[PDB]
Each structure stands twice: as C-alpha cells, then as structure tokens.
Design a protein around this ligand. Sequence first.
Ligand code: FES
Ligand SMILES: [K+]
Ligand SMILES: [Mg+2]
Ligand SMILES: [Mg+2]
Ligand SMILES: [Mg+2]
Ligand SMILES: [Mg+2]
Ligand SMILES: [Mg+2]
Ligand SMILES: [Mg+2]
Ligand SMILES: [Mg+2]
Ligand SMILES: [Mg+2]
Ligand SMILES: [Mg+2]
Ligand SMILES: [Mg+2]
Ligand SMILES: [Mg+2]
Ligand SMILES: [Mg+2]
Ligand SMILES: [Mg+2]
Ligand SMILES: [Mg+2]
Ligand SMILES: [Mg+2]
Ligand SMILES: [Mg+2]
Ligand SMILES: [Mg+2]
Ligand SMILES: [Mg+2]
Ligand SMILES: [Mg+2]
Ligand SMILES: [Mg+2]
Ligand SMILES: [Mg+2]
Ligand SMILES: [Mg+2]
Ligand SMILES: [Mg+2]
Ligand SMILES: [Mg+2]
Ligand SMILES: [Mg+2]
Ligand SMILES: [Mg+2]
Ligand SMILES: [Mg+2]
Ligand SMILES: [Mg+2]
Ligand SMILES: [Mg+2]
Ligand SMILES: [Mg+2]
Ligand SMILES: [Mg+2]
Ligand SMILES: [Mg+2]
Lengths: 99, 52, 97, 135, 96, 57, 86
Amino acid sequence: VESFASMLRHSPLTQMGPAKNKLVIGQIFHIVEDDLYIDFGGKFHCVCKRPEVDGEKYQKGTRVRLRLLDLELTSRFLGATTDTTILEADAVLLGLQES
Amino acid sequence: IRNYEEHMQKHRKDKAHKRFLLMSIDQRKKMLKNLRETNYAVFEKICKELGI
Amino acid sequence: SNEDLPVPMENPYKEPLKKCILCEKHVDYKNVQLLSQFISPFTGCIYGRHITGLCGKKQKEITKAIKRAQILGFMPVTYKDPAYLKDPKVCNIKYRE
Amino acid sequence: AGSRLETVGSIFSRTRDLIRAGVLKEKPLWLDIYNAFPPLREPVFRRPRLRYGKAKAAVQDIFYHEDRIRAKFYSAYGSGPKAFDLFNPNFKSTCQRFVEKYIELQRLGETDEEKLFVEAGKALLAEGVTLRRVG
Amino acid sequence: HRFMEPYLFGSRLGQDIIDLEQTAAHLQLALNFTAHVAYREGIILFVSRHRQFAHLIETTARDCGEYAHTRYFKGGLLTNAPLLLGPGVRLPDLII
Amino acid sequence: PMKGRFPIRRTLQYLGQGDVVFKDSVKVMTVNYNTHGELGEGARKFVFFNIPQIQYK
Amino acid sequence: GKATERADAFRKAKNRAVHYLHYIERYEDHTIYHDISLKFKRTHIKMKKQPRGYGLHCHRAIMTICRLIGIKDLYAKVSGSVNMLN
RNA sequence: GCCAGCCACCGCGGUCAUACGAUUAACCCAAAUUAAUAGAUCCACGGCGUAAAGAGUGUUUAAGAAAAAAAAUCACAAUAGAGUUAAAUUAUAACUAAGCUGUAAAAAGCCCUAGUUAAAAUAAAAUAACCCACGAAAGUGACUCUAAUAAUCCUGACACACGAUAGCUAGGACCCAAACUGGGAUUAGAUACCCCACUAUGCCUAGCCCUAAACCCAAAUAGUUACAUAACAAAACUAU
Ligand code: FES
Ligand SMILES: [K+]
Ligand SMILES: [Mg+2]
Ligand SMILES: [Mg+2]
Ligand SMILES: [Mg+2]
Ligand SMILES: [Mg+2]
Ligand SMILES: [Mg+2]
Ligand SMILES: [Mg+2]
Ligand SMILES: [Mg+2]
Ligand SMILES: [Mg+2]
Ligand SMILES: [Mg+2]
Ligand SMILES: [Mg+2]
Ligand SMILES: [Mg+2]
Ligand SMILES: [Mg+2]
Ligand SMILES: [Mg+2]
Ligand SMILES: [Mg+2]
Ligand SMILES: [Mg+2]
Ligand SMILES: [Mg+2]
Ligand SMILES: [Mg+2]
Ligand SMILES: [Mg+2]
Ligand SMILES: [Mg+2]
Ligand SMILES: [Mg+2]
Ligand SMILES: [Mg+2]
Ligand SMILES: [Mg+2]
Ligand SMILES: [Mg+2]
Ligand SMILES: [Mg+2]
Ligand SMILES: [Mg+2]
Ligand SMILES: [Mg+2]
Ligand SMILES: [Mg+2]
Ligand SMILES: [Mg+2]
Ligand SMILES: [Mg+2]
Ligand SMILES: [Mg+2]
Ligand SMILES: [Mg+2]
Ligand SMILES: [Mg+2]
C-alpha cells in the first residue's frame, strides 16, 4: 500500500510547479459553434475560440496544446466574505497536437 | 531642559516647545523623587552638582 | 518515519517585487529633463500615481523636486519646456484620439 | 409528529429522545443502522463565525526539497520543451528528470550548487534532451 | 470554508488539497450506510443542482431503480409534502 | 460579587474560614514583597489571598 | 399562531406546536440536573435546583411550562425584560 | 344623558352605561370594614455608538495597579522665527470701441467704463492629492534656511500648560470676500431667498476672551476570536 503523501510528490500536478506559462496538452470534450471546451487535466475546464486556420478539424476528442496562465480564475471583491469563483480556467491555443 | 530653555528665550510665543519644557521638568521631578527613595547618597550628589 | 511529508519552508517561487521606473535612482531639481517628463505639455499640471506609475516614495520626491525648480528658476510653471518636448514618453495618458 | 428544530442537535439525538419520551411509537428504519454504524462526527449545527484578530488558519503549505530545485530550473530554462501531460499517472516531466538526476548527482558528495546545476545540465545534454537557456 | 480546515491535507500554491485518507474513511461508511438503507427497502433520492451532470445523474438513478431530483427545488417540497405531492406520501429515507 | 479577579474571596465564608489567631502579645505585622521575579510568587499570593483572612480574625 | 380570528388563532397554534418539540432531561423526574444561568437577548433568567419538598416557586409563565414538561421542583428568577416570547 | 357624578393607575358619562345614583343578585373580609397620613420594603457588583452617561486635550501631585511575555522612534502637510514668489486680481498708463455689469426673466448700478498691452502692494496657497504623513488636541499640505517634536517605553484631578471660529482693547495693512445698512426685483406683506454698492471683520504685531455637532457622538493601558447575533450602526469580549 502506497501512502497518500508519496502520491502527491510524484504526481504530475506537483511537478508542474506554478501554473503560469506552462505548456499543457488537453482534450476537447464539448463543441459549440465558436467555443471549444477543453479539459487539460486540471480541476476545471478552459474555454477557447476556434482559430480561423484549420478550424474544421477541431472536433470532439481532439488533442490540442495549451498555455496555462491561471489554474482557476478567482478574485476577491470588497464586501465579499468568500471569493466568487468562475468555475473555469484560463488558457490559450497554440495549435493542434502534433501526432 | 537647558536646550529647551534657550529655545524658549528666543521664541517666546512658541507653545509646542513650552509644553515640552514643562513635561521635561515634570519627568525629571518624578525621577528625582524615585531616586531619592532608593539611593539617597547618589541623589544628594546629583542634586548638588546639577544645581537642581 | 515518513519522509514524504512537506517541510515548513518559505515559498521558493516568490517572483521579485516590481520596481518602479525611478527605483534606486537619485532624483534632482537640477535635471529639468527628468522632471519635465511627468508634466502635461499643454497645461503644466503634475500627473498622479495612476498616470505616472511611480511608487509611493519617488512620487513625493518628484513633486517636491519639481516645485523647488519652479521657484528657484529652472523650469517653466504654466507649460512644459519646449526644448524637452521630444523626450521619450513615460506616462500612460493619451490626448490624441 | 416530530421535531423540526435544526439547531437543537443532530438527527440521531432528537429521534432517540422522542422515542424515549413516548411520542414517536414507530421506530424509523434508519435508526437501527445509525446505532450499528455511527459516523466519525455527529452532525451538530454550528454557526460559521468569521475569524477576527491574530488567529490564522492551521493549513500548512505543501512544499518539498524538490520544489526548491524546480524553481532554479524554471527560473533559468523556463518551461521545458516537452509538453506536460496530466492524463498519465506515471508521467515523467523534463523538470522531474532534472530533479531526479540532481538528487543522484548530489549523492556523490558535491555541495556547491553551481557545480550541481552545471553538471546536471551537461548530463541531460548527454541524453539528447534540449535545454535552450532563456536569455 | 472554515469548517473544511480539518479535512484539508494542505495548500499547494494557493490550491487546497483534500486529504484522501480521511476521504476513504468517510466514503467507506457512506457506501456502507447507503447499502444498508437500500437493503431494508428504503427510498433514496439523488439531489444535485448542477447544470453539467444533471442528465448523467438522472440516468444513474434510473439504472439503480431509485429516484433523482436534479431540477429546480420547490420551496415546500420536503416540508409541506402533503400539499405538493399528494394526500399520503412516504418521505424518502435517505438523500444523496 | 461580579467585579474583581476572584470574587469568591470577598464573601463572608472565605473571610471566616481562615484560622490564624495571633497571641495577645502580637500588635504589628509588617509584610514586604516584590512585584517582579519568580521568587516572590509565594509572598504575592500570600498578600492576595491570606491577608484578608488574617486581618478578619 | 396568528390569524384574523381568535378562534382560528388557537387552532393554528396547537397544530404548529407539536412540530416543534424538545426533550428536557429531568434528574429523578422532579428537578433539573444542575443550576442554569442564561441571558437570552435582553432577558436574564436564573434557575436553581431544589429538593422534593419545596417545588414550583417560579414565574407564573414558567410554572405553566414546568407542569407541562414534568418538572415539579424548581426556583426561577427573571431579570430584565419580561417579554413572554423571549 | 360629557349633565348630576366616579377612579389607587389605565379610564367611564355626549337618550340601549355590567364604571354615575337606586334596585335584585353575587363576591370578599368580619366585631370589625373602608378611607387618609406616616413606616417596613424598594435604585447600580447595573450602565456610558444611537437612550441620562467617556467630560475639548496633554503632563503631574494625592493615590493605585505591576505579578507570564514583550516593547526608544522615524521618507512625507508638526510647531516658532527669518528670507523669498509663481498663477490670478487691482492702483496706474497707452490704444481701440459705445456701451459695461446682472438674472429663470428684469430693474438698479456704472458710462471716471469695457477689451488688449505694460505693472507694485496686500491677500490667498491650481495639478501633485486615486497619496494618508506630522502634532497631545484644536490643527497643518507654495519655496528656502535656522531652532525642533517629553519619558528605558502603566493609570491619574478641581492643580500647571494649551485650545478652530466668532467677539473685545491698542497700532498697522486693505487686492478681495463680506453680517449690518441703502437701492433694484419678487410677494398679499419679504425689515428673506435673487441682483448692485459699501462698513465691521477675515490679515500682521502685543494682550484678552476659553466657547463648538471641540463628534470618529465609541475614555487610557494590556490583550482574546473563545462564549455569542435585542434592534440600528462602525462584530463580540476580558483584566487594571
Ligand atoms: S520601487 Fe523602489 S524607489 Fe520606487
Ligand atoms: K499655490
Ligand atoms: Mg411590563
Ligand atoms: Mg363607588
Ligand atoms: Mg338607560
Ligand atoms: Mg371598578
Ligand atoms: Mg352602581
Ligand atoms: Mg446622549
Ligand atoms: Mg450617548
Ligand atoms: Mg475624560
Ligand atoms: Mg483631562
Ligand atoms: Mg508614587
Ligand atoms: Mg509668527
Ligand atoms: Mg494701494
Ligand atoms: Mg437702466
Ligand atoms: Mg479698465
Ligand atoms: Mg487628509
Ligand atoms: Mg502622548
Ligand atoms: Mg514623541
Ligand atoms: Mg501620568
Ligand atoms: Mg481661542
Ligand atoms: Mg479670530
Ligand atoms: Mg478677530
Ligand atoms: Mg468691552
Ligand atoms: Mg482693531
Ligand atoms: Mg475693509
Ligand atoms: Mg467689494
Ligand atoms: Mg431693501
Ligand atoms: Mg474637529
Ligand atoms: Mg463628547
Ligand atoms: Mg474623546
Ligand atoms: Mg483618561
Ligand atoms: Mg501615553
Ligand atoms: Mg487598545
């Protein structure tokens, strides 16, 4: 039996370090007309817009490359006891995964 | 205290320093009473040398 | 006996605090060019923190340095000196739209 | 009929008291399960007071000696050319490989950080990975 | 949240990490308690007001043969049951 | 009693439960103690607790 | 229970009363276990334990509640506001 | 039938009074009953943002606390002197113009005026300031220089020192603002709001007066986030 402490040390999330400016690949799980819901393995799902080039090949299950900036967008405003989360993540598209 | 008195003789209408001069005297007066009730021999020498 | 527990150490990823434009630099009332860049050329007003962007220490020093030059006779009061009108722009205010 | 007060106590506390009182003559089915299997904490209502003063939270930060090594690698070389993949439980990152070889190298008796950092970069270069220095 | 402090293993760069060791102990009793009430022919209701898994949770209860309520919750449903549902209604014996 | 650090010591029972009766030849008792230092703990607590009991009798 | 008519007011109060029920522990079914001192809002009420012989020396509203609960020996003093609801 | 009258407190009576007067009946004390005046008893080991309550401020004396730990501060507009002037305005001069000020709309006033150019004195201190510093408080933010901000770091008065603005006494200054006063307009009246003129005075030196919503309506020194929501507001509380 492996202790839970050892699992966190070798987990990919811990090895990433700060979430800012990290190249993380993700898989698309939902498609809208212009919005691509991408799961990059984090707690929440980032949303990006379909690029104008090679946009027809962005389908469900396709793998893409992302640049994580904030793992979970969250800010504090005056008069709020608890921060108001957005239930999403911030990322940008660098293209499609090079298989 | 000597420095404030020299300042007071020039600037007579100054009130911030006049309060400081009075408070400085009171603190020295309080401390002299404390010294007298603990070490009389030193208090007598301090009183004579400084002219207080 | 478990060596996998986290240790009580400070954050190693603490990015250095941002430096202002004039940090570690000595402002003066004799160099008009340095003082003139923070003055509106059309009116002669002094920009605030939200426009100048300087920190809390060099903003006051610039204000005192500028006013010393106003009276001592080193820079105009109601307008920016035209000789230093082509200096690089450091403020974040735009008049032309 | 029953008790509808949330703040008096847990559901177990009110149910057994009413049965003992004699008003509820039909024992609920879930009560027997609760007696056999009680939870870790009894569900007692408590007001979420806001913390004032010098009191802070007891949560400790998750930091490791590896993180200190990872900071130097990220500061110098930035993010590695390899793309991180969180879907693989056994993924080995480029920074993780650098840390693992850093630990092995320092087991040889080297104390200077500069020697450990420079040699580790040279060792990774022998494996074929790219370590283009930033700036 | 203040009451979640004991259940947090720690915070990683501002992100809290839940201690799974305490989760396993709680989940073991949760599944054990859930099965026993279902063994005794008890009504189990799945409640989740989240508009990303409403269909998945609703289908989950249908396979198990139990009831689910992932829609908008009326004010007097569980309390004022006779008026909302019917004259004689048997209240659920467990809510998930 | 509500006010005070130890309101119990200001009731009749506490003043009456102290049994220390001086002889007829004792007239003056002088107590000297310090307000600082761990050595004076016994003296300060004696003044704070037992002296009212001694004076009452 | 509040309504436009007094007769309807009594009916609502009775039915809604059985929904809110407490269980008060009674030491030997005649007295509370220990003396209780509480300050609810702006009402100071102090209750003391008593033996079997001397019982039910309390506020006339407290006596009505005590006879319903089952307590038969109690002393209670009410200070401050004497509002019935508090 | 708000009449005659009743009440310990709240109240009753204004042509259908269980409250006045009488009657029937009832209740409660009883050789006593009721009324009147004294007395027993009864206020705070409770409170001080909004309720009566933290006194305008600081130091010190009398007095009292100390008991565990620990603590001389600080870029910036304190204060009092000395020197200095950018932007505006005015005396005043030149030139042009016949009008200029003013309001929701006008009148009155001015025409010794208005615009431009040149320019002392007095007075007041744009932007910086979306900063929050200094002083015990009231206060202070144009520039320069000098002097300078008590206590080896508790509480403390009726005592000592201080205290915006208005007001008084004497001398000096007067751009401009301006109670009072006069004129215009409005209005039923307007000894008001609005418009024009001007005085005390706002300013400097010396003295006095010692009042403010002197309010952050929250006293000083050490602390705690435990217990716990009257209401509202600026969450609750312990020790001296
Ligand atoms: S941040 Fe260093 S002087 Fe401005
Ligand atoms: K100025
Ligand atoms: Mg009453
Ligand atoms: Mg009568
Ligand atoms: Mg009649
Ligand atoms: Mg009567
Ligand atoms: Mg009668
Ligand atoms: Mg008051
Ligand atoms: Mg008050
Ligand atoms: Mg006071
Ligand atoms: Mg005082
Ligand atoms: Mg003394
Ligand atoms: Mg002067
Ligand atoms: Mg003149
Ligand atoms: Mg005219
Ligand atoms: Mg003119
Ligand atoms: Mg200010
Ligand atoms: Mg002070
Ligand atoms: Mg000081
Ligand atoms: Mg003192
Ligand atoms: Mg005065
Ligand atoms: Mg004055
Ligand atoms: Mg005056
Ligand atoms: Mg006079
Ligand atoms: Mg005069
Ligand atoms: Mg005048
Ligand atoms: Mg005038
Ligand atoms: Mg008139
Ligand atoms: Mg004030
Ligand atoms: Mg006051
Ligand atoms: Mg005060
Ligand atoms: Mg005081
Ligand atoms: Mg002090
Ligand atoms: Mg304090």
